[PDB]
């Protein structure tokens, strides 16, 4: 909201001259209004979208997005702060596609060992007593991480 | 018409609030903040305290100053423009060079 | 018949309120506001505070002044006209030629 | 473009906030506390109270001091960084060694 | 190694809180109460009020005193120990014999 | 040990509260009240105001006095007894003979 | 108001122009605003995505009405 502060992170990207993609619980008009004008004159090309859903649900799926793109998740809850984060902590992707109801990333740049490692930790998740519902949602993450969804 | 201050009173005008130059070339809009810089339009005769003579003010007309916007600061409209009225004590510093 | 103010009291009369000339040739209606400008009809002997003599007022009869309409400002009716009574401290500035 | 303080005003800058050395080896994150230590960037002429002369400030430029961050303390940003402005009275002590 | 207080400021350290010797043999638990007794670590130059001379403090270094723990009492950490900073006015009495 | 009050401080002890002999030869219950009478245990040097000398306290040690139990009255425990600490201004009168 | 603009912040040039307008108690009409065709068509071109919408019912009905007013007619 008034949580606009994070300028040095923002300008670092401006210095870079590259577009910025933002994933968080929510973004309010104060941040969006300035963002729109900054993008319009070509200072920065930046668009923001909302996280997957429920607190535990979105938080759980944030690490894979970051690791897949080689980025770092900002732990507000833990040892990290809004401003506290370098440009290098940001994830990188070839391009993204955004529409009114959907967000897509063509290809984040991350190491295969990290991609597989995310998948490897999933194996405990795969063989689960709960089975119904737990596996269905879980597999969807899995397919997105390295496979495909039909 | 113009204004003549009544000793120890200085009439100054406020400068731009949160000018869009913060953090670089970034345009920063006004989001609940006020400007403390001003220009001295008029100078009063001086302090009348302790009876012995009147002491002259340390600020000349046309100076650029930094001041504390407190209770001692009054607002009036002259020639349909906003001005500030405060004592010498309320002005914290002078911007020079 | 006329009135004689007592030391450190100044009798002034209020000028027109929200005169229709704001913004150029634009006519401004009354936004429930009141005029802060007046003329000095009478001058008191002076301030009798600190002890050393009596100090004369800095406002001469017939001056045009700007003042703060506070509690210290009282209203009286003389010769069926409205007048204001306030101390020297209340009058912030003088409008000159 | 530096800043010259006006008599009895001292310009200082705040040090690191809630440094993680409290309790022991343990590193304490900032819960929501603010640092009271600072460095004196500039020194004003002195206190002008009671007419006769001007009394000099007891703090030399470049000192490391401990102060009470009260209403009197004000914040301004010059050369794109944060500074604090307060009187001599607000500074409680000097750190020496 | 140590801190030098400014004039009219006295640095003292607080004594034991709700000491277990109340009523004689009986041990009294601490039920939300704080000790008012301290020791004077340092003495400032003295009061500088009303120009003429600087008046010396009535408290010696190393004295045991009783004081009013009000707003005027500040807390600092010296060599990882708790100290209190207050004026002469805040110290109510001296414990002797 | 014993206590030595600092200048303009008087240490006194409170007398019996709601003593039974009120309104005649009547034993009266302690419905809800306190005693304003005390004895002067110790005397401070005196008031230290306006520079020129220190004015001695009008009340000698061992006097029986009447006082106003206000904010200025503080309570401490000495040798397992309750005492009151207040200034000269607080004590209204002296009971004689 | 929401974005990079303010009440006062706006120059007379910002204001649009038209030959004349007709206003009554329940209706407002503009005879002809003066604007370029490229802007008129550009507004219409961006409408084509709006035209080809999955919802169809209600979405298209209101949408078409704007379209008719922008370059055609309403009967």
XYZ file of C-alpha atoms in Angstrom:
710
model
C 0.000 0.000 0.000
C 2.105 2.814 1.460
C 4.590 -0.045 1.484
C 5.998 1.655 -1.642
C 9.490 1.819 -0.156
C 11.794 -0.517 -2.060
C 13.054 2.209 -4.390
C 16.733 1.029 -4.444
C 15.500 -2.402 -5.605
C 13.271 -0.725 -8.219
C 15.972 1.694 -9.479
C 18.509 -1.135 -9.634
C 16.255 -2.680 -12.257
C 15.879 0.761 -13.909
C 19.686 0.986 -14.012
C 19.643 -2.436 -15.690
C 17.033 -1.276 -18.207
C 15.011 -4.505 -18.015
C 11.303 -5.308 -17.240
C 10.189 -6.393 -13.742
C 7.589 -9.075 -12.775
C 6.102 -8.931 -9.225
C 4.459 -11.728 -7.159
C 3.004 -10.908 -3.683
C -0.168 -11.074 -1.525
C -1.449 -7.826 -3.074
C -0.534 -4.504 -4.702
C -2.445 -1.243 -4.086
C -3.019 1.799 -6.272
C -0.393 3.964 -4.531
C 2.358 1.643 -5.807
C 0.470 0.951 -9.056
C -0.188 4.644 -9.919
C 3.489 5.610 -9.811
C 4.327 2.327 -11.526
C 1.956 3.083 -14.426
C 3.512 6.505 -15.071
C 7.073 5.124 -14.760
C 6.262 2.429 -17.347
C 4.435 4.863 -19.670
C 7.427 7.183 -20.224
C 9.734 4.193 -20.575
C 11.635 4.726 -17.310
C 10.885 1.089 -16.360
C 8.623 -1.559 -17.952
C 7.001 -3.184 -14.896
C 3.769 -5.175 -14.350
C 2.564 -6.906 -11.132
C 0.311 -9.939 -10.482
C -1.144 -11.685 -7.394
C 0.183 -14.913 -5.824
C -1.712 -18.298 -6.319
C -4.230 -18.070 -3.405
C -4.388 -18.981 0.290
C -1.426 -17.966 2.498
C -0.029 -21.484 2.909
C -0.926 -22.301 -0.729
C 0.896 -19.300 -2.274
C 3.838 -19.403 0.118
C 4.389 -23.095 -0.643
C 4.579 -22.480 -4.414
C 6.750 -19.306 -4.250
C 10.108 -21.153 -3.738
C 9.801 -23.156 -6.923
C 9.110 -20.041 -9.005
C 12.178 -18.323 -7.520
C 14.491 -21.358 -7.808
C 13.293 -22.071 -11.348
C 14.187 -18.495 -12.377
C 17.327 -18.444 -10.190
C 15.851 -15.806 -7.881
C 15.506 -15.384 -4.131
C 12.195 -15.271 -2.263
C 11.906 -12.388 0.182
C 11.042 -13.666 3.594
C 9.191 -10.823 5.301
C 8.414 -13.265 8.071
C 12.043 -14.372 8.416
C 15.501 -12.650 8.120
C 14.524 -10.383 5.153
C 13.059 -6.885 4.632
C 11.254 -5.016 1.813
C 14.249 -2.838 0.884
C 16.695 -5.532 1.927
C 17.263 -7.392 -1.325
C 19.717 -6.898 -4.182
C 18.940 -6.844 -7.935
C 20.871 -10.115 -8.236
C 18.299 -11.683 -5.835
C 15.677 -11.201 -8.588
C 14.871 -14.183 -10.839
C 15.460 -14.118 -14.620
C 13.257 -15.395 -17.476
C 13.328 -15.080 -21.303
C 9.859 -13.488 -21.395
C 6.459 -13.661 -19.700
C 2.846 -13.520 -20.887
C 0.137 -11.828 -18.853
C -3.594 -11.450 -19.322
C -6.561 -10.442 -17.196
C -7.029 -13.929 -15.673
C -3.611 -15.703 -16.311
C 0.218 -15.269 -15.869
C 2.776 -17.277 -17.926
C 6.604 -17.454 -17.966
C 8.271 -18.708 -21.186
C 11.402 -19.967 -19.447
C 13.059 -18.961 -16.202
C 16.799 -19.440 -16.106
C 17.793 -21.841 -13.414
C 20.067 -24.800 -12.976
C 18.769 -28.309 -13.714
C 20.272 -29.568 -10.470
C 18.082 -27.005 -8.678
C 15.022 -27.954 -10.840
C 15.555 -31.647 -10.091
C 16.279 -30.844 -6.440
C 12.850 -29.188 -6.163
C 11.410 -32.279 -7.821
C 13.443 -34.632 -5.557
C 11.993 -33.123 -2.342
C 8.575 -33.694 -3.926
C 9.020 -37.499 -3.717
C 8.105 -37.485 0.005
C 5.127 -35.375 -0.996
C 4.276 -37.902 -3.795
C 3.952 -40.923 -1.504
C 1.466 -39.507 0.956
C -1.095 -41.128 3.256
C -3.636 -38.382 2.423
C -3.559 -39.333 -1.333
C -6.894 -37.737 -2.341
C -6.665 -33.964 -2.956
C -3.084 -33.799 -1.600
C -1.637 -35.680 -4.585
C -3.891 -33.956 -7.151
C -2.700 -30.413 -6.317
C 0.849 -31.643 -5.634
C 1.217 -33.273 -9.076
C 0.019 -30.089 -10.763
C 3.006 -28.235 -9.257
C 5.217 -31.126 -10.411
C 4.001 -31.001 -13.996
C 4.529 -27.235 -14.099
C 8.088 -27.498 -12.680
C 9.452 -29.784 -15.459
C 6.578 -31.434 -17.370
C 3.352 -30.210 -18.952
C -0.338 -29.667 -18.159
C -3.160 -30.775 -20.470
C -0.604 46.237 -1.784
C 2.094 44.600 0.372
C 2.839 43.640 4.003
C 4.984 45.229 6.738
C 5.829 42.793 9.639
C 5.436 43.816 13.296
C 8.993 43.366 14.799
C 10.555 39.886 15.351
C 8.038 38.601 12.817
C 9.234 37.283 9.492
C 7.024 36.699 6.473
C 8.135 33.806 4.272
C 6.640 31.674 1.506
C 6.707 27.864 1.318
C 8.546 26.028 -1.481
C 7.479 22.890 -3.429
C 6.449 19.817 -1.396
C 8.158 16.485 -2.176
C 9.431 17.590 -5.566
C 9.589 14.622 -7.940
C 13.364 14.117 -7.721
C 13.647 11.568 -4.864
C 16.013 8.645 -5.345
C 17.027 9.739 -8.843
C 15.068 10.385 -12.049
C 12.066 8.722 -10.416
C 8.935 10.849 -10.277
C 7.578 10.775 -6.738
C 4.041 11.953 -6.206
C 2.759 13.700 -3.119
C 1.715 11.079 -0.587
C 1.124 12.877 2.760
C 4.142 15.199 3.423
C 4.882 18.978 3.578
C 7.838 21.300 2.581
C 9.907 23.065 5.298
C 11.864 25.407 2.926
C 10.952 29.037 2.272
C 11.979 32.527 1.081
C 11.969 35.670 3.272
C 9.497 38.192 1.848
C 9.654 40.613 4.814
C 11.733 41.376 7.930
C 10.456 42.894 11.197
C 12.200 45.666 13.172
C 13.525 43.228 15.777
C 13.062 41.771 19.279
C 11.635 44.162 21.955
C 12.587 42.000 24.986
C 14.359 43.246 28.166
C 13.656 47.000 27.413
C 17.184 48.007 26.303
C 16.954 49.048 22.624
C 15.633 46.733 19.908
C 17.840 43.987 18.457
C 17.886 43.609 14.636
C 16.981 40.374 12.866
C 19.698 38.069 11.540
C 17.871 37.366 8.274
C 17.840 39.718 5.279
C 14.968 39.922 2.764
C 15.146 37.429 -0.130
C 17.064 34.737 1.815
C 16.349 31.036 1.437
C 15.683 29.428 4.788
C 14.777 26.212 6.535
C 12.213 26.558 9.310
C 10.209 24.664 11.880
C 6.523 24.607 10.994
C 5.031 24.849 14.469
C 2.260 26.690 16.331
C 4.173 29.985 15.974
C 3.553 29.835 12.189
C 0.454 31.645 10.903
C -1.062 31.604 7.379
C -2.539 34.585 5.472
C -3.554 35.231 1.867
C -1.828 38.197 0.071
C -2.645 39.109 -3.542
C -4.370 35.717 -3.528
C -1.102 33.849 -2.599
C -0.147 31.779 0.483
C 2.382 33.247 2.951
C 3.733 32.176 6.340
C 4.236 34.350 9.430
C 6.657 33.299 12.182
C 9.265 34.685 14.555
C 13.075 34.638 14.095
C 13.272 31.844 16.673
C 11.172 29.538 14.451
C 13.689 29.791 11.516
C 16.261 26.977 11.932
C 18.781 27.725 9.110
C 19.793 29.626 5.943
C 20.652 27.943 2.592
C 23.681 29.588 0.932
C 26.040 29.179 -2.096
C -19.628 60.681 19.970
C -16.466 58.566 19.655
C -14.503 56.011 21.719
C -11.140 56.245 23.540
C -9.178 52.922 23.841
C -7.225 52.025 26.970
C -3.448 51.302 26.761
C -2.408 48.417 24.439
C -5.882 48.313 22.912
C -6.515 49.189 19.303
C -9.908 49.867 17.753
C -10.202 48.832 14.101
C -12.965 48.206 11.562
C -13.243 45.155 9.273
C -13.024 45.388 5.463
C -15.055 43.508 2.790
C -15.265 39.710 3.129
C -14.288 37.532 0.153
C -14.461 40.383 -2.358
C -15.415 39.175 -5.840
C -12.033 39.574 -7.587
C -10.244 36.240 -6.890
C -8.570 34.448 -9.800
C -8.640 37.550 -12.022
C -12.017 38.633 -13.457
C -13.640 35.602 -11.857
C -16.428 36.134 -9.331
C -15.870 34.307 -6.065
C -18.836 33.503 -3.868
C -18.704 33.416 -0.087
C -17.327 30.090 1.154
C -18.558 30.917 4.694
C -15.201 32.716 5.303
C -14.477 36.102 7.008
C -12.163 39.136 6.200
C -8.864 39.528 8.153
C -8.118 43.147 6.982
C -9.008 46.322 8.873
C -8.331 50.050 9.434
C -7.058 51.570 12.724
C -9.612 54.023 14.134
C -7.942 54.500 17.553
C -4.663 53.852 19.397
C -4.190 53.144 23.121
C -1.489 54.738 25.315
C 0.748 51.667 25.186
C 1.845 48.481 26.954
C 2.251 48.555 30.747
C 3.959 45.204 31.497
C 7.698 44.850 32.293
C 7.722 48.071 34.514
C 10.147 50.315 32.652
C 8.051 53.314 31.572
C 5.127 52.958 29.181
C 5.938 51.655 25.711
C 4.217 53.354 22.743
C 2.296 51.412 20.120
C 3.839 50.867 16.687
C 0.534 51.502 14.932
C -0.493 55.045 14.032
C -4.133 56.134 13.570
C -5.472 55.643 10.025
C -3.236 52.621 9.219
C -4.367 49.629 7.188
C -3.605 46.374 8.961
C -3.816 42.606 8.823
C -4.713 40.837 12.060
C -5.592 37.468 13.522
C -9.237 37.221 14.572
C -8.830 35.450 17.887
C -10.400 35.491 21.358
C -8.677 38.815 22.153
C -10.835 40.455 19.444
C -14.126 41.890 20.724
C -17.111 43.435 18.877
C -18.892 46.733 19.697
C -21.493 48.936 18.015
C -20.643 52.696 17.704
C -22.842 55.195 15.802
C -24.565 52.070 14.462
C -21.319 50.670 12.859
C -19.335 47.506 13.661
C -15.900 47.906 15.288
C -13.244 45.552 16.641
C -11.204 45.865 19.848
C -7.893 43.999 20.176
C -4.366 44.338 21.516
C -1.222 45.222 19.500
C -0.105 41.566 19.660
C -3.164 40.487 17.618
C -2.242 42.732 14.623
C 0.285 40.784 12.509
C 1.131 43.359 9.775
C 0.536 46.732 8.075
C -0.511 47.252 4.411
C 1.385 50.234 2.996
C 0.712 52.494 -0.041
C 26.406 21.998 -0.897
C 26.690 21.794 2.899
C 24.565 23.274 5.725
C 25.395 26.030 8.252
C 23.445 25.745 11.571
C 21.937 28.813 13.211
C 23.026 29.545 16.855
C 22.319 26.835 19.496
C 21.506 24.353 16.725
C 23.572 21.251 16.171
C 23.384 19.075 13.074
C 24.036 15.373 13.682
C 23.503 12.098 11.828
C 21.967 8.918 13.276
C 24.032 5.709 13.529
C 23.018 2.076 12.819
C 19.618 1.068 14.193
C 19.311 -1.721 16.767
C 22.711 -3.291 16.030
C 22.695 -7.038 16.619
C 25.022 -7.259 19.625
C 22.439 -7.296 22.449
C 22.266 -10.021 25.072
C 25.390 -11.854 23.933
C 26.530 -13.762 20.839
C 22.888 -13.714 19.755
C 21.908 -11.565 16.809
C 18.712 -9.610 17.447
C 16.615 -8.503 14.511
C 15.005 -5.081 14.559
C 11.592 -5.477 16.183
C 10.770 -1.748 15.748
C 13.398 0.191 17.782
C 15.425 3.304 16.802
C 19.156 4.240 17.434
C 19.931 7.177 19.809
C 23.648 7.616 18.803
C 24.970 10.210 16.359
C 27.890 12.230 14.945
C 28.067 16.052 14.943
C 28.254 17.365 11.372
C 27.984 21.060 12.325
C 27.959 23.447 15.312
C 25.964 26.688 15.698
C 27.294 29.979 17.132
C 25.796 29.441 20.599
C 22.989 30.495 22.965
C 21.733 34.114 22.545
C 19.635 34.107 25.765
C 19.883 37.068 28.214
C 21.365 39.556 25.668
C 25.004 39.963 26.879
C 27.345 38.183 24.423
C 26.742 34.692 23.014
C 27.698 31.532 24.960
C 29.651 28.923 22.918
C 28.497 25.329 22.463
C 30.246 22.571 24.440
C 30.460 20.226 21.452
C 33.115 20.352 18.728
C 32.426 19.233 15.142
C 33.004 15.495 14.567
C 32.060 14.383 18.127
C 30.175 11.168 18.850
C 27.169 11.864 21.042
C 24.162 10.357 22.759
C 20.940 12.375 22.563
C 17.265 12.337 23.448
C 15.155 12.164 20.294
C 12.275 14.414 21.259
C 9.976 16.955 19.602
C 12.893 19.403 19.270
C 14.772 17.011 16.938
C 13.987 17.654 13.259
C 14.875 15.768 10.056
C 16.136 17.141 6.723
C 17.787 15.477 3.751
C 20.710 17.091 1.908
C 23.005 15.532 -0.707
C 20.380 12.751 -0.661
C 20.961 11.530 2.964
C 19.349 11.895 6.413
C 20.491 14.434 9.022
C 19.084 15.557 12.392
C 18.736 19.106 13.758
C 18.464 19.796 17.514
C 19.668 22.147 20.231
C 22.602 21.574 22.640
C 20.055 20.868 25.393
C 18.786 17.719 23.627
C 22.302 16.124 23.627
C 22.733 14.161 26.889
C 26.368 12.937 26.558
C 29.586 12.450 24.552
C 31.199 9.038 23.838
C 34.972 9.220 24.403
C 38.033 6.937 23.920
C 36.549 3.701 30.103
C 33.996 6.179 31.473
C 31.582 9.027 30.701
C 31.776 12.769 31.523
C 28.346 14.356 32.312
C 27.314 17.836 31.172
C 26.554 20.598 33.671
C 23.556 20.065 36.000
C 23.531 16.380 35.003
C 24.298 13.608 37.443
C 25.036 10.009 36.500
C 23.888 7.406 39.028
C 23.273 3.654 39.108
C 20.175 1.938 40.543
C 20.397 -0.392 43.557
C 18.631 -3.714 44.309
C 14.869 -3.882 43.597
C 12.499 -5.120 46.342
C 15.306 -6.551 48.441
C 14.468 -9.794 50.223
C 15.081 -8.289 53.721
C 11.645 -6.607 54.284
C 9.974 -7.395 57.612
C 13.185 -9.042 58.799
C 13.582 -12.778 58.105
C 10.710 -12.899 55.597
C 11.473 -12.875 51.895
C 9.302 -10.480 49.946
C 8.653 -11.362 46.341
C 8.889 -8.695 43.681
C 5.334 -7.636 42.913
C 5.754 -5.013 40.158
C 7.827 -2.466 42.187
C 11.115 -0.640 41.372
C 14.015 0.626 43.626
C 14.426 4.415 44.198
C 18.017 4.239 45.624
C 21.241 4.739 43.682
C 24.957 5.672 43.769
C 26.475 8.799 42.156
C 29.017 7.739 39.525
C 29.590 11.232 38.077
C 28.892 14.921 38.747
C 28.367 17.662 36.142
C 29.888 21.172 36.299
C 26.712 22.692 37.747
C 23.678 24.865 36.959
C 24.321 27.715 34.435
C 20.976 29.495 34.974
C 20.780 33.326 35.240
C 24.286 34.185 33.805
C 26.149 35.044 37.022
C 28.599 32.236 37.811
C 28.054 28.517 37.407
C 26.660 27.045 40.620
C 28.332 23.844 41.876
C 26.389 20.680 42.589
C 25.652 19.666 46.178
C 26.340 15.996 45.500
C 29.762 14.403 45.882
C 31.115 11.607 43.694
C 30.441 8.193 45.256
C 27.462 9.353 47.391
C 24.389 7.203 48.029
C 21.167 8.948 47.065
C 17.399 8.697 46.896
C 15.796 10.109 43.744
C 12.494 10.592 41.956
C 12.417 8.299 38.925
C 10.469 10.533 36.564
C 10.649 11.589 32.903
C 13.872 13.532 33.598
C 15.596 10.182 34.302
C 17.302 8.639 31.262
C 18.884 5.164 30.853
C 22.180 4.324 29.080
C 24.502 1.320 28.858
C 28.154 1.888 29.956
C 30.695 -0.983 29.697
C 27.586 -3.194 29.476
C 26.116 -1.800 32.768
C 22.892 0.130 33.423
C 23.221 3.810 34.365
C 20.788 6.667 34.972
C 21.089 10.298 33.862
C 19.177 13.053 35.679
C 19.567 16.600 36.952
C 20.343 17.679 40.555
C 16.686 18.660 40.941
C 15.610 15.007 40.547
C 17.775 13.845 43.545
C 15.630 14.047 46.715
C 18.082 12.913 49.484
C 21.452 11.441 50.578
C 21.812 8.280 52.734
C 24.436 8.610 55.512
C 25.866 6.621 58.478
C 21.336 3.465 59.114
C 19.500 6.811 58.981
C 18.538 9.390 56.355
C 19.780 12.907 55.550
C 17.377 15.001 53.409
C 18.632 17.170 50.581
C 17.978 20.956 50.734
C 14.283 22.005 50.909
C 13.288 18.450 51.802
C 11.736 17.500 55.105
C 11.357 13.954 56.382
C 8.309 13.421 58.597
C 6.263 10.501 59.917
C 2.451 10.223 59.790
C 0.406 10.101 63.006
C -2.699 8.008 63.809
C -5.488 7.967 61.203
C -9.107 8.561 62.254
C -8.230 8.643 65.943
C -11.186 7.632 68.051
C -12.549 10.687 69.832
C -14.466 12.448 67.030
C -17.675 14.408 67.555
C -17.568 13.846 71.308
C -16.677 10.917 73.553
C -17.125 8.508 70.652
C -14.974 5.706 69.294
C -15.030 6.119 65.499
C -14.445 3.442 62.923
C -12.008 3.858 60.061
C -14.670 4.392 57.389
C -12.167 5.770 54.778
C -9.677 8.553 55.684
C -5.999 9.530 56.323
C -4.071 11.649 58.868
C -2.547 15.012 57.864
C -0.420 15.354 61.062
C 3.198 14.288 61.424
C 6.543 14.731 63.222
C 9.711 16.199 61.647
C 12.414 13.522 61.691
C 14.976 15.441 59.588
C 15.711 18.888 58.119
C 17.407 19.748 54.809
C 19.824 22.683 54.333
C 17.121 24.902 52.850
C 15.795 26.418 49.621
C 18.303 27.199 46.843
C 16.602 29.801 44.681
C 17.572 33.223 43.264
C 21.328 32.585 43.920
C 22.172 34.886 46.876
C 22.542 32.499 49.850
C 20.562 29.438 50.880
C 17.456 30.160 52.969
C 17.161 27.895 56.060
C 14.017 25.901 56.809
C 11.588 27.361 59.361
C 10.930 23.943 60.929
C 13.340 22.498 63.499
C 13.809 18.747 64.097
C 11.242 17.106 66.400
C 8.406 19.553 65.609
C 4.805 18.438 65.258
C 3.367 19.596 61.965
C 0.313 19.792 59.778
C 0.783 19.150 56.050
C -1.038 18.762 52.754
C -0.616 15.218 51.440
C -0.267 15.915 47.733
C 1.869 14.705 44.810
C 4.986 16.315 46.341
C 4.800 13.790 49.222
C 6.864 10.620 48.698
C 7.006 7.406 50.790
C 10.067 5.292 51.724
C 10.682 2.531 54.277
C 13.462 3.164 56.864
C 14.309 0.695 59.666
C 10.945 -0.984 58.956
C 8.955 2.288 59.450
C 6.896 4.474 57.105
C 8.148 8.011 56.474
C 7.103 10.907 54.275
C 9.342 13.206 52.232
C 8.089 16.653 51.223
C 9.202 20.248 50.763
C 8.775 23.161 53.218
C 5.958 24.573 51.054
C 3.906 21.377 51.616
C 3.812 21.769 55.461
C 0.955 24.174 56.320
C 1.331 24.587 60.139
C 3.004 23.612 63.438
C 1.252 22.192 66.552
C 2.713 23.813 69.685
C 3.003 23.017 73.424
C -7.812 11.141 -10.569
C -6.685 7.638 -9.720
C -3.479 7.800 -11.819
C -0.917 10.568 -12.662
C -3.522 13.383 -12.799
C -5.051 15.947 -10.404
C -8.202 18.134 -10.293
C -6.418 21.422 -11.039
C -3.701 19.681 -13.023
C -5.076 19.961 -16.545
C -4.731 22.583 -19.277
C -7.671 23.896 -21.404
C -6.005 22.085 -24.353
C -6.679 18.787 -22.498
C -10.431 19.423 -22.848
C -12.118 17.912 -25.911
C -14.083 19.843 -28.548
C -17.450 19.394 -30.294
C -19.702 21.413 -32.647
C -22.580 21.517 -30.157
C -24.388 19.318 -27.633
C -28.033 18.658 -26.726
C -29.041 18.139 -23.104
C -32.357 17.426 -21.408
C -33.544 16.189 -18.027
C -32.852 12.505 -18.814
C -30.488 12.596 -21.898
C -27.100 14.051 -23.070
C -26.112 14.241 -26.779
C -23.011 15.458 -28.661
C -23.520 16.527 -32.299
C -19.926 15.934 -33.369
C -16.716 15.906 -31.387
C -13.682 16.762 -33.445
C -11.219 13.958 -33.419
C -9.150 12.087 -35.920
C -10.389 8.959 -37.680
C -7.249 7.056 -36.748
C -8.194 7.568 -33.089
C -11.888 6.665 -33.819
C -10.881 3.492 -35.689
C -8.135 2.714 -33.184
C -10.753 2.658 -30.424
C -12.858 0.422 -32.686
C -9.917 -1.879 -33.574
C -9.204 -2.571 -29.878
C -12.934 -3.405 -29.598
C -12.478 -6.467 -31.860
C -11.050 -8.497 -28.955
C -14.018 -7.306 -26.938
C -16.329 -8.460 -29.787
C -14.882 -11.967 -29.824
C -15.624 -12.843 -26.206
C -16.378 -16.224 -24.617
C -19.236 -14.836 -22.467
C -21.272 -13.661 -25.540
C -24.522 -12.957 -23.627
C -24.635 -9.499 -21.957
C -20.949 -8.765 -22.703
C -21.536 -8.409 -26.452
C -24.899 -6.632 -26.071
C -23.554 -3.637 -24.066
C -20.288 -3.698 -26.023
C -21.997 -3.419 -29.425
C -24.006 -0.441 -28.179
C -20.769 1.490 -27.508
C -19.561 0.434 -30.976
C -22.645 1.710 -32.774
C -22.346 5.066 -31.010
C -18.598 5.407 -31.751
C -18.914 5.163 -35.578
C -22.388 3.907 -36.584
C -25.956 4.528 -35.463
C -28.476 3.349 -32.859
C -32.109 2.540 -33.681
